[PDB]
């Protein structure tokens, strides 16, 4: 298990434009296209991202290319953020994957808002952090995924992604 496999499990793979859990146009492995309700706007974003005139459909290789870029962007974003970087630096590699997962799902600004959770994670108060993380819109709206990510933060193992 690693961050790519983890996010592939959590996000799935779809080669045609679909709506994500929030109703937003997305493609590939959780590549958000736009928050606009316009499918035409989403298609335009897709074409720009891929570099060709699509039919709203991409190949697996194209989906994986966007995914690579998106994981890289999530990490980059953490490292550029004054609130997130010190917590990320404090974590082991498994828990770092949980952090990347959250930023991939909700963005750098969104995760940086988990101030109290972040402090508990830096303090390595794992059970307390887990409880705090669950007191969130995130957990309520995507509880199964959040439970997997939280278990990863709680235990520093991949147990929630095995079997
Ligand atoms: C709240 C989890 C986290 C920790 C460090 C960096 C980003 C995200």
- Rg of the Cα trace of the chain? 16
Chain mean position to CA 68: 12
User: Exposed (0-12), middle (13-18) or buried (19+): which is 107, by Cβ within 10 Å?
Assistant: middle
91-99, long-range: CB within 8 Å, 24+ apart, which pairs? 91/121, 92/156, 94/152, 94/156, 94/157, 94/158, 95/121, 95/152, 95/153, 95/156, 96/3, 97/2, 97/3, 97/6, 97/152, 98/149, 98/150, 98/152, 98/153
Method used to determine the 3D structure = X-ray
97 lines ligand 1 (CB under 6 A): no
CA 136 remoteness from chain centre? 16
CA of 100 to the centre of ligand 1 (A): 7
DSSP string, 29-91: TTEE--S-S-HHHHHHHHHHHHTS--SSB--HHHHHHHHHHHHHHHHHHHHH-TTHHHHHHHS
118 is in an annotated binding site: no
Please give the Cα distance from 55 to 7 (Å, whole number). 26
Please state, in angstroms and as integers, the Cα–Cα distance from residue 47 to each residue in 17, 68, 150, following that order.
Answer: 12, 17, 35
**Burial of 53 by CB count in 10 Å (0-12 exposed, 13-18 middle, 19+ buried)?**
exposed
What distances in angstroms separate CA 73 from CA 8, 40, 45, 86, 99, one per listed residue? 16, 25, 17, 18, 13
Name the burial class of residue 30, with classes exposed (0-12), middle (13-18) and buried (19+) by CB atoms within 10 angstroms of its CB: buried
**For residue 63, what are its two tokens?**
């989906």
CATH number at residue 151: 1.10.530.40
Check if 104 has its Cβ closer than 6 Å to any atom of ligand 1. Answer: no
What is the extent of the structural domain holding 42?
1-163
Measured CA to CA, the distance from residue 10 to residue 142 in angstroms comes to 10
Query: How many domains would you assign to the chain?
Result: 1
Active-site annotation holds for 70: no
Breaks in the chain after residues, C-to-N cutoff 2.5 Å: none
- How far apart CA 87 and CA 2 sit, in angstroms, is 19
Ligand 1 centroid distance, CA of 159 (Å): 19
DSSP secondary structure, 32-43, as one string: E--S-S-HHHHH
Q: Is 84 in the pocket of ligand 1 (CB under 6 A)?
A: yes
From atom 5 of ligand 1, which residue's Cα is the shortest distance away? 88
68 labeled binding residue: no
- Tell which atom from ligand 1 comes closest to the C-alpha of 114: 1
């Amino acid at each position: 298990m690693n961050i790519f496999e983890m996010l592939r499990i959590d996000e799935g793979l779809r080669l045609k434009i679909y709506k994500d859990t929030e109703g937003y146009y997305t493609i590939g492995i959780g590549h958000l296209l736009t928050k606009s309700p316009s499918l035409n706007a989403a298609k335009s974003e897709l074409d720009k991202a891929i570099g060709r005139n699509t039919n709203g459909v991409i190949t697996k290789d194209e989906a994986e290319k966007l995914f690579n870029q998106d994981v890289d962007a999530a990490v980059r974003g953490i490292l550029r953020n004054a609130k997130l970087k010190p917590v990320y630096d404090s974590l082991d590699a498994v828990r770092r994957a949980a952090a990347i997962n959250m930023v991939f799902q909700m963005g750098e600004t969104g995760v940086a808002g988990f101030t109290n959770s972040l402090r508990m994670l830096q303090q390595k108060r794992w059970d307390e952090a887990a409880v705090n993380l669950a007191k969130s819109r995130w957990y309520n709206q995507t509880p199964n995924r959040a439970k997997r990510v939280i278990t990863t933060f709680r235990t520093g193992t991949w147990d929630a992604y095995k079997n």
